[PDB]
């Protein structure tokens, strides 16, 4: 278990670390998207309420992320996919901050739990979407891969996107966006990245996540104890020992940090 470093405490300390460290890992949760104006999709009232009147077969919001229900009726998922699809919402200040840090080469990796795909829109290249995203779509059968744009037309017109390779008389020959559905396994890319990034990171920043769900929750405990860990979240996380606790709205705190960093970061305000 990691003990909190006694020599790293202040927001000035965090600012200096942000200036000196060159291989930063940023863990982001739902907190970096709350200002983007995205309707919730994990409860009621949420998107499930509007989908209940259209698709009376949905037992719960979680069903649209279940592979078995998806095979029976993929339509309610694709109506959800249309509402959250990339390009419809603007990335928050937190995304822009991470994107700039990647442009300057200071970003080792951004591990996120979000599926809103705002990282790609923001121009962040070194991303790892642990729960997947709409970045790519893949056929359920022949595993043919296409870009996000290749299925934008169908999803927008509420037509279930079909696979061009598989036979046209094939029922389940449909392009499913690479969101990690229930039961499915984490992409191989994640574990290779985490295995070696952990021995490469010099600074860990957590932004807007409670760190209660796997596999992102396990990351802070898997990196060497000497690496500084900064928390940027609305609530403290008692089950962890962060060196710096910046508590409050993520956009507010990031804005403050950008002000203190100056340079290209200040121009983000």
């Amino acid at each position: 278990m990691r003990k909190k470093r006694k020599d790293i405490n202040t927001i000035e300390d965090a600012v200096k670390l942000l200036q000196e460290c060159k291989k930063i890992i940023v863990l982001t949760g739902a907190g970096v998207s709350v200002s983007c104006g995205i309707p919730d999709f994990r409860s009621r009232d949420g998107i499930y309420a509007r989908l209940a009147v259209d698709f009376p077969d949905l037992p719960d919001p979680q069903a649209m992320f279940d592979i078995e229900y998806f095979r029976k009726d993929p339509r309610p998922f694709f109506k959800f996919a249309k509402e959250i699809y990339p390009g419809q919402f603007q990335p928050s200040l937190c995304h822009k901050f991470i994107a700039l840090s990647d442009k300057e080469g200071k970003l080792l990796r951004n591990y996120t739990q979000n599926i809103d795909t705002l990282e790609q829109v923001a121009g962040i290249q070194r991303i790892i979407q642990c729960h997947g995203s709409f970045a790519t779509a893949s056929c359920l059968i022949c595993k043919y891969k296409v870009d996000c744009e290749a299925v934008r037309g169908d999803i927008f017109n509420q037509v279930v996107p079909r696979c061009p390779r598989c036979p046209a008389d094939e029922p389940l020959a449909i392009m499913k966006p690479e969101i990690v559905f229930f039961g499915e396994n984490l992409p191989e890319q994640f574990h290779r990245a985490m295995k070696y990034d952990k021995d490469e990171v010099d600074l860990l920043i957590v932004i807007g996540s409670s760190l209660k769900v796997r596999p992102v929750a396990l990351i802070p405990s898997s990196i060497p104890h000497e690496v500084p860990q900064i928390l940027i979240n609305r609530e403290p996380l008692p089950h962890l020992h962060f060196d710096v606790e910046l508590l409050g709205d993520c956009d507010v705190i990031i804005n403050e940090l950008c002000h203190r960093l100056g340079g290209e970061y200040a121009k983000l305000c």
């Binding site: 909190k4 790293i8 405490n9 202040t10 927001i11 609305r234 609530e235 403290p236 962060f242 060196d243 710096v244 606790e245 910046l246 508590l247 409050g248 709205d249 507010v252 705190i253 804005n255 403050e256 002000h259």
Partner: peptide
């Protein structure tokens, strides 16, 4: 510049913070 409360040794309370008891 933003307003904040410094709680020694390492806690900062900004706008929108959710700390209770």
């Amino acid at each position: 510049g933003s307003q904040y409360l410094f709680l020694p040794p390492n806690r900062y309370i900004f706008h929108g913070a959710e700390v209770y008891s």
